[PDB]
Amino acid sequence: TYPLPPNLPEQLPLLTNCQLEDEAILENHLYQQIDLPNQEVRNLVFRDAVFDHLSLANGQFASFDCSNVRFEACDFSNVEWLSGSFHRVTFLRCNLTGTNFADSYLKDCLFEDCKADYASFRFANFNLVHFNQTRLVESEFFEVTWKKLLLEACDLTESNWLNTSLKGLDFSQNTFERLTFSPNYLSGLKVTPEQAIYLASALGLVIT
Amino acid sequence: MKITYPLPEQLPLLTNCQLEDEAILENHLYQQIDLPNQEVRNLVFRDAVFDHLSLANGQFASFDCSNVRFEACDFSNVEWLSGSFHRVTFLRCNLTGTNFADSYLKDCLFEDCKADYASFRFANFNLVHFNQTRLVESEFFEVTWKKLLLEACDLTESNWLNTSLKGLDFSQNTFERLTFSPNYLSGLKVTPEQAIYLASALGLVIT
Ligand SMILES: [Cl-]
Ligand SMILES: [Cl-]
Ligand SMILES: [Cl-]
Ligand SMILES: [Cl-]
Description:
two-stranded parallel sheet
């Protein structure tokens, strides 16, 4: 089962500028080429919309609510989305470098061809979340609660999976040269022989 | 090379003998003696060599063995439960099903022995070396050990539950599979092929 895509019509009216205010709702448009760096805005609602080349770089968005939205080629580098809510959201070709989603709720979300090195999902709750062709080097998947999590064609090198169940995940279609994990949460992970050898070494086997 | 002193017409020969409770066999070369199906308590073998002794199917309560060479002896299906072994070498012995459960083995060597089904369950090892010894379906569970070495042994289907594998080297041995405790695995040295087995036994689903 794949995440549901955002519920969008074929045609949405185009806007090339927007303003952010606390409790503001941005909805029902295609928002294109907007550069709003270093903002701090509470209780934002983005819904039923597409954002194309939006930058919120170094933004801080408390109690963020996002539903039925596709973000395309957006810059969210270092953004704080602590305890955010994301439902039927796609991040496509987005810069998520250092983006902080700690404590967020993600349901029916897709990350496709994103740069997400150092991104944090610490304590996140996932339900139908798919990472596809997304770079996740030194990312944080610490104590994540999840159902129907899929990762394919992702670079997971040095990602942190401590306190997160790996039972029923398939890392065989991803790459990692290093991985941090909890030994008691390892059983049931699907891997290649090369990955198995790495994991066995990480568990303390001395392999010739 | 050993870190302890080696074992020494050097000894007078005996080619027959009888066993009785509390018997002490010492200071002889005992050779070609067939004594199967014995049940003898507090037997002592010491300062002696036994060449082609059979004790097949023997039952020995509180066996005590010290400074002894066993060469080409048959101990198949012997029970030496809670035995005491100090400075003992087993060379080309048949140890099929031999039961050492709960024994103490200090400075012992098993060289080129056939030891299918042999049990060391609950044993305590203190300087014990297995070399070129077949240990298929053997028991090594709940074993406490210091200076245990195994080399060129077949460990297929041996059982190591609740025995620490930290500091052991199985890479110089072979096994198709074996049973172990996950929490006792760290620090074992293995080949990649062995590691793949162990990884799958830990529940990794390997493509
Ligand atoms: Cl989409
Ligand atoms: Cl890999
Ligand atoms: Cl060893
Ligand atoms: Cl265990």
